[PDB]
Design a protein around this ligand. Structure first.
Ligand SMILES: COc1ccc([C@H](Cc2cc([N+](=O)[O-])ccc2OC)c2c[nH]c(N)n2)cc1F
Length: 372
């Protein structure tokens, strides 16, 4: 089972992964970004230069107008829409059709990306961060309530046309290897977690573990990079720099501005360190760590192989984005309020190193790593 859902994700590097969904009756097909960093089901519902398709409510016999608007400011830009409901389904997902809240995006400024394969967003986080308020039930919540699909989904984000799998309602064994280790979901808004220790090539970053989670640490498929707090990013980069000093790179590379290139097939992966995040475990004083390779944080972008540094600075806490998720099979066990990590069956590595998920490790005062 779940074979119907395997490989149901596609994507364009740096733009996220999208699943195919249909909305309305008769069904209208759209590509919806899979975002565990937001909680709205929003879709383009009016003409736009970047949208080559859009939700046409007037053509759905099953549409219902909630007669309420929503205004979402996004960085330097925004989107606005009319809230409503309609029948939604996932062609390559569970065989269910559900009535869900839909934010019909009717106006936007600097939101939709020029030439992006997706026309909407599927916010899989919790209601607390749903716009305009926590009373707009997130899609996955309606899905679970209206069907018998277990309260759980898993993501295998593979990279370099990127692809992956979103398994709704189960765990597909062929998507990972070894063990799944679970970290508790600290609070149900974002998929917030607690990082209790960071290593660069085995060397402890040695910071107040509260810094790692300041002001929070989330798992966000809607973010490309691994984004770390300023103090943490600064330390991580210093350490990553030291670890790879056999070659020097322009300060622009460490800022994600400049690229770094090598003769096709000669990328010096080994001079780059691995990165380990220790996550709070399910058992007392027990943690586990997930380790990613340069193949994860060096985003491929001629007859050379060129890459961009995919670790960047955050002011809104740690974001375990695609850079992290692409090394692992990530299980969002909402039912049990925990997130599973297993080595991904599709992650990119070489013959000497591999992403890892190891445990347990004795760790005291893990609660103290949580920032308030
Ligand atoms: C409910 O309101 C929003 C939901 C999601 C986003 C973006 C989605 C997005 C993802 C990627 N992407 O690269 O996956 C690129 C561009 C995007 O928006 C244009 C986002 C930001 N962070 C998260 N989790 N998602 C912005 C919103 F205003």
């Amino acid at each position: 089972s779940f074979v119907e859902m395997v490989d149901n994700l596609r994507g364009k590097s740096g733009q996220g992964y999208y699943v195919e969904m249909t909305v309305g009756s008769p069904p209208q097909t759209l590509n919806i970004l899979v975002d565990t960093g937001s909680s709205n089901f929003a879709v383009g519902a009016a003409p736009h230069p970047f949208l080559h398709r859009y939700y046409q409510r007037q053509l759905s016999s099953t549409y219902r107008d909630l007669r309420k608007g929503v205004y979402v400011p996004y960085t330097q830009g925004k989107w606005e829409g009319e809230l409503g409901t309609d029948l939604v389904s996932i062609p390559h997902g569970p065989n269910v059709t559900v009535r869900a809240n839909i934010a019909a995006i009717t106006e936007s400024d600097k939101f939709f990306i020029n030439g992006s394969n997706w026309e909407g967003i599927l916010g899989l986080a919790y209601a607390e961060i749903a716009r305009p308020d926590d009373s707009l039930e997130p899609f996955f919540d309606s899905l679970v309530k209206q069907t018998h699909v277990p309260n759980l989904f898993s993501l295998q984000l593979c990279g370099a046309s990127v692809g992956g799998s979103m398994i709704i309602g189960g765990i597909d064994h062929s998507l990972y290897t070894g063990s799944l280790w679970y970290t508790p979901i600290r609070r149900e808004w974002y998929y917030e977690v607690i990082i209790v220790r960071v290593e660069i090539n085995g060397q402890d970053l040695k910071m107040d573990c509260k810094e790692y989670n300041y002001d929070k640490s989330i798992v966000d498929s809607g973010t490309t990079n691994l984004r770390l707090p300023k103090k943490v990013f600064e330390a991580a980069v210093k350490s990553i720099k030291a670890a790879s000093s056999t070659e020097k790179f322009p300060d622009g590379f460490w800022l994600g501005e400049q690229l770094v290139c090598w003769q096709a097939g000669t990328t010096p992966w080994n001079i780059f360190p691995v990165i380990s995040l220790y996550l709070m475990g399910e058992v007392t004083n027990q943690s586990f760590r997930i380790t990613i390779l340069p193949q994860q944080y060096l985003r491929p972008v001629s007859q050379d192989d060129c890459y961009k540094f995919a670790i960047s600075q955050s002011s809104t806490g740690t974001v375990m984005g695609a850079v992290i998720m692409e090394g692992f099979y990530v299980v969002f066990d909402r039912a049990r309020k925990r997130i599973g990590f297993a080595v991904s069956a599709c992650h990119v590595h070489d013959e000497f190193r591999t992403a890892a998920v190891e445990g347990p490790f004795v760790t005291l005062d893990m609660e103290d790593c949580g920032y308030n």
